[PDB]
Amino acid sequence: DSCIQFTRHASDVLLNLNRLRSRDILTDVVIVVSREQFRAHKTVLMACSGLFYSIFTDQLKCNLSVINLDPEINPEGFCILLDFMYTSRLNLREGNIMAVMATAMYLQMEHVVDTCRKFIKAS
Amino acid sequence: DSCIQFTRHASDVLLNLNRLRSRDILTDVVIVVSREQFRAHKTVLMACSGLFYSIFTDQLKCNLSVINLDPEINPEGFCILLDFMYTSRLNLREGNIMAVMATAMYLQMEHVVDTCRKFIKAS
């Protein structure tokens, strides 16, 4: 086509979606990880995760307001990944890298799994 | 912070949100423009437009499944802007630039209004 493109549009959209999350505006699901609860937008979860994409395209699960993750999933690892989904920023540290990689493998977030594997290989 | 960043994350998120729109997955509103109907995600509309941000933060309008725009709004202008919201690409042409600018002013999409003003000033 003969379209023009606004370079910062995608980043600005994601920044506003994170502002809605922080104010709990139009969140439509709660993700339960052990005792911890995380509110989010189903569309953003699907856009970032192969696991959530599969869950919310399912004709029965698409209507659920609560999703319980596998008890092996660490709440801190999930929190770091949820923050990444809404910001593009990953808080990867020596003390959390194993829990982050395991959570990213479960959530099917291929690019996060790739950087965790590379950072582990370096050490 | 000491975060790392994935450059393509925001663009990849927007690409997946557009894939959900094209398949009509988790769309939660219909925007009526004259006789024409457009399905979309409220969160994406809010993230891109000052008008939709105001509408869906309103305690009564946040629950509406149908929104009717002002009868002066041109359906083609709206369609071009809805496509921009989900792709960052604007199909700006000599034959549509006046309708696009007027629709962007109504929707409160400041960056689109700015490029339309500049393109009109050049001609």
């Binding site: 023009i4 493109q5 606004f6 370079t7 | 490029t115």
Partner: peptide
């Protein structure tokens, strides 16, 4: 704005 750019030519993509």
């Amino acid at each position: 704005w750019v030519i993509p």
